[PDB]
Amino acid sequence: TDDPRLLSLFSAQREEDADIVIIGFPYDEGCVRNGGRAGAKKGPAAFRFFLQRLGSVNNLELNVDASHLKLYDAGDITASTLEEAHEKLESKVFTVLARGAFPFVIGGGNDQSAPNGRAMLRAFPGDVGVINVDSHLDVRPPLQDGRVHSGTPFRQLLEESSFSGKRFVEFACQGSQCGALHAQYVRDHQGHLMWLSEVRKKGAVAALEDAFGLTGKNTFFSFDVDSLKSSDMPGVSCPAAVGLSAQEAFDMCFLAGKTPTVMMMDMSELNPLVEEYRSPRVAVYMFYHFVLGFATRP
Ligand SMILES: [Cl-]
């Protein structure tokens, strides 16, 4: 064609030949357990639909040519329970990290972020940083029988002995959604809360630069799309009245892509049952901006 897009970068015949490996996590039981609306299990299929259609690989507005990057779709994690699904996701992500490639995980519920974090902690012993981009802090306690959910993943990570809380950042969190007890929990573990209002004051990219300074080496960039305002991103499990704009999200993902300390990324809560067209496009354009950033990464 006279207009190659992301689809054209899937030139890797073998997974090991790819710079970036996409892994799908089509599960939303974690959401329903956390009192949310089902539908995020369709996130990966919606994302793939527009992945085949969008994103100029040579972008003359930003002056980035991503045509040399190689992408690979590893398919979906397949399991008969949510817990086996988490184990398989953890193991797959680890293999990608272990050979120095970049895993990008498309959800699915935010519960995926726990196994992703464990893969990081094993790949980079005692030397991991984590940013959680979410309107919520996601440090809720499990259900009565020990059942984890879309609101517990960073409580699980902060309880890891090898993980330093000083290298944990809650980014674009919202006071109206987040309990004093849960903020306290993060603060008492030495984590950092960069509230939406603080992010706005500084500018999203500037604020994310500061966050990457605190997370340091071997950073997991964990992007929950319900951190975006629902005017731009309605199709998520918990739609936000206020939040990050699409452009802020794009600029943040570009920064993540270009920052050589960011070693993996996930994207949670995309919910096509809530809204099926505009929202998956935003999600794909977020990934696209990461890809452009990655093309420039020193
Ligand atoms: Cl807003």
Q: Find, among 94, 102, 97, the residue nearest to 72 by Cα.
A: 102
Q: What is the resolution of this structure in A?
A: 1.6
Cβ neighbours of residue 280 under 8 Å, at least 6 residues apart?
Answer: 43, 46, 47, 49, 50, 235, 270, 272
Q: How far is the CA of 85 from the centre of ligand 1 (A)?
A: 35
Q: How far is the CA of 244 from the centre of ligand 1 (A)?
A: 6
Q: Is 20 exposed, middle or buried (0-12, 13-18, 19+ CB in 10 A)?
A: buried
**What residues flank ion ligand 1 with Cβ within 5 A?**
229, 242
With beta carbons less than 8 A apart as the criterion, state whether 296 and 258 touch: yes
- For residue 19, say whether it is annotated as part of any ligand binding site: no
Fold adopted by 1-298: Arginase; Chain A (3.40.800)
What tokens appear for 118 in the block? 């464990």
- For residue 136, say whether it is annotated as part of any ligand binding site: yes
Residue with tokens 């300390």: 261
How far is it, in rounded angstroms, from Cα 230 to Cα 239? 5
Q: How far is the CA of 284 from the centre of ligand 1 (A)?
A: 21
Three-state secondary structure readout of 85-138: HHHHHHHHHHHHHHCCCEEEEEECCHHHHHHHHHHHHHHCCCCCEEEEECCCCC
For residue 173, give the DSSP letter. Answer: E
What tokens appear for 72 in the block? 């690979």
> Inter-axis angle of helices 204-215 and 246-258, to 10 degrees?
40
Question: Any idea how long the chain is?
Answer: 298
Where the chain is broken, by preceding residue (C–N > 2.5 Å)? none
> Inter-axis angle of helices 278-295 and 246-258, to 10 degrees?
30
How far is it, in rounded angstroms, from Cα 219 to Cα 124? 10
Residue with tokens 């951190």: 227
Q: How was this structure determined?
A: X-ray
User: Distance between the two ends of the chain, CA-based, in angstroms?
Assistant: 30
Residue with tokens 């109206």: 176
Cβ neighbours of residue 277 under 8 Å, at least 6 residues apart?
Answer: none
Residue 59 pairs in a beta bridge with: 64
- The region that residue 89 occupies, defined by phi over 0 for left and psi between -120 and 50 for alpha, beta otherwise, is alpha
With beta carbons less than 8 A apart as the criterion, state whether 218 and 263 touch: yes
Q: How far is the CA of 197 from the centre of ligand 1 (A)?
A: 9
Q: How far is the CA of 18 from the centre of ligand 1 (A)?
A: 37
Residue with tokens 């020990």: 146
How far is it, in rounded angstroms, from Cα 172 to Cα 208? 10
- For residue 76, say whether it is annotated as part of any ligand binding site: no
168-173 vs 64-65, strand pairing mode: unpaired
How far is it, in rounded angstroms, from Cα 26 to Cα 89? 11
Virtual torsion, Cα 139, 151, 167, 131, nearest 10 deg: -150
Q: How far is the CA of 210 from the centre of ligand 1 (A)?
A: 21
Q: What is the maximal distance between C-alpha atoms in the chain?
A: 57
Residue with tokens 């970049």: 102
